[PDB]
Amino acid sequence: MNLTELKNTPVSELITLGENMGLENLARMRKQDIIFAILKQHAKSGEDIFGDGVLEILQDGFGFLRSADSSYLAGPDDIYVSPSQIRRFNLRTGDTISGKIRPPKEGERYFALLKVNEVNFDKPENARNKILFENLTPLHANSRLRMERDNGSTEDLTARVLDLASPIGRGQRGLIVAPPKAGKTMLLQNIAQSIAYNHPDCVLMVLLIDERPEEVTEMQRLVKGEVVASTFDEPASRHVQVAEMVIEKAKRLVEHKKDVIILLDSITRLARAYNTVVPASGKVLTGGVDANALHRPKRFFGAARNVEEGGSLTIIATALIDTGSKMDEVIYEEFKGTGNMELHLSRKIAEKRVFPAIDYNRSGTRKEELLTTQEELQKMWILRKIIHPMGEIDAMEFLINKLAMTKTNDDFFEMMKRS
């Protein structure tokens, strides 16, 4: 009846559903084709069919309603919307549209939208009056996103260390710097669990670029939110498309006074896709990266801000360093001081089998007075006073044993004042 649940159902249930409807030879076809075949057979029955998706306005004028299940990939089951709907209902890219759809008339291969009754989880009339994201005035982060989980076991202290190293708030534009094989993949998993548990209201989005297929499955099964990704086999034009879709969708949610958190991975890989797709403008910098090529990722990364009117957009990205590629290090140079939060991971700490491998001295956040209270903020200052003299390799080891014997970070603070 509704396209939303058909994609969520496994392929095995779809095969059984299609067989009783009279369809045949469905197991050997793709999942997208099965959905189209099932809808087509149900469409001619006469019962109304609903749908949902994310609008993607093309340069021609007509758009499509991509689905987050397929990672916003074009497919036969995508809903086609004529430019007339964009006229009557003023819509932009990334808008969420849910409504009745009609069977595709002969001469067209895509379903068409009949009527719109829900735009961005709101009435269509109210969505027309929402202020644009650009017109919103950015501000510093005010409310802190707690990272410590009470249910979290003492085996993994990554969540607790992040609170001591660099607190994160709504609208933060933090950047993660880490060499390869430094544990950055599961570092975001701890952040995703903490955000989902401590702040269920916040919308969590995980974006993966050039990630292995196995990595995508575990992220979807672990993160309590919608996760989109693009495998390495997909062309470069697909990687940029996924990134553009997520940021546009995130901006629309911000306009509705809603908080959305994006865990980008990785900014270095994302800039590679933009460099390839964007044609050369005649100016080539070191490493073969065009100056105009890096303009797009900066605008995407810089969109993170705290809106004074309401809502916030928090973007956390991982930067790859010491990867052996000249093109990778030059990108990190452009994104050096562009973030208000720095989280540097050390390779030499990681090889010592001590986790989390966080360089406490280098990592930090800017304007942390607003995030933390008066007492909590000054308790971190004295902690940094005793961690700075010691080496970074043993600095993490010092915190690991101290945090192990303390149930919570509050107990750790009073222990430090004891000596």
Ligand X SMILES: Nc1ncnc2c1ncn2[C@@H]1O[C@H](COP(=O)(O)OP(=O)(O)O)[C@@H](O)[C@H]1O
List the interface residues with ligand X, window 275-294 (CB under 6 A): none
Q: In the complex with Mg ion, which residue's Cβ is closer, 352 or 366? A: 366
Find the binder of ligand X among 34, 127, 177, 182 (CB under 6 A).
Answer: 182
Interface residue with its own copies among 17, 23, 112, 139 (CB under 8 A) is 139
The token pair that represents 415 in the structure block: 């222990």
Annotated binding site for ATP: 169-174, 181-186, 212
CA-CA distance, 227 to 219, in Å (whole number)? 7
Residues 147-176 that bind ligand X (CB under 6 A): 156, 158
154-193 binders of Mg ion (CB under 5 A): 185
Residues in the interface with ligand X (CB under 6 A) total 12
Q: Report, in Å, the least distance between residue 209 CB and ligand X.
A: 13
Residue 235 makes contact with its own copies by CB under 8 A? yes
Q: Whole-angstrom Cα distance, residue 324 to residue 332?
A: 13
Q: Please report, as residue ranges, which positions from 87 to 106 form the binding site for its own copies (by CB under 8 A).
A: 87, 90, 92
For the bound state, the minimum distance from the C-beta of residue 242 to ligand X, rounded and expressed in Å, comes to 19
Q: Taking a C-beta distance cutoff of 8 angstroms, is the pair 271, 318 a contact?
A: no
The one among 96, 185, 194, 363 contacting ligand X by CB under 6 A = 185
Contacts (CB under 8 A) with its own copies, residues 285-324: 286, 288, 291-292, 295, 298-299, 301-302, 305-306, 323
**Distance between CA 369 and CA 377 in Å, rounded?**
7
Shortest distance, CB of residue 196 to its own copies, whole angstroms? 22
Q: Does the footprint of ligand X cover residue 366 (CB under 6 A)?
A: yes
Shortest distance in whole angstroms from residue 8 CB to its own copies: 13
In the range 321-350, which residues lie near its own copies by CB under 8 A?
323, 325, 333, 336-338, 340
Calpha distance 144→150 (Å, rounded): 17
Q: How far apart are CA 389 and CA 398, in angstroms?
A: 12
How many binding residues for Mg ion (CB under 5 A)? 1
Nearer to ligand X, 211 or 255 (CB): 211
Neighbours of 255 (CB within 10 A): 21
Span from 27-35, 64-72, 191-199, 311-319 in contact with its own copies (CB under 8 A):
27-35
Q: Of these, 355, 406, 409, 412, which contacts ligand X (CB under 6 A)?
A: 355
Minimum gap (Å) between residue 236 Cβ and its own copies: 6
**Residue 158 C-alpha from the chain's centroid:** 20
Pick between residue 98 and residue 230 the one whose CB is nearest to its own copies. 230
Count of residues in the chain? 419
182 binds, among ligand X, its own copies, Mg ion, none (CB under 5 to 8 A by kind): ligand X
Q: Does 312 bind ligand X (CB under 6 A)?
A: no
Residues 171-210 that bind its own copies (CB under 8 A): 173, 180-181, 210
Q: Please, are residues 114 and 101 in contact by the beta-carbon 8 Å criterion?
A: yes
Q: Is residue 213 a contact residue for ligand X (CB under 6 A)?
A: no
Residue ranges of the binding site: 169-174, 181-186, 212
> Furthest-apart CA pair in the chain: how many Å?
80
CB of 348 to ligand X, least distance (A): 14
Instruction: Specify the residue for token string 């080539």.
Output: 284
Nearer to ligand X, 297 or 356 (CB): 356
Residues in contact with ligand X by CB under 6 A are: 156, 158, 180-186, 355-356, 366
Residues in contact with Mg ion by CB under 5 A are: 185
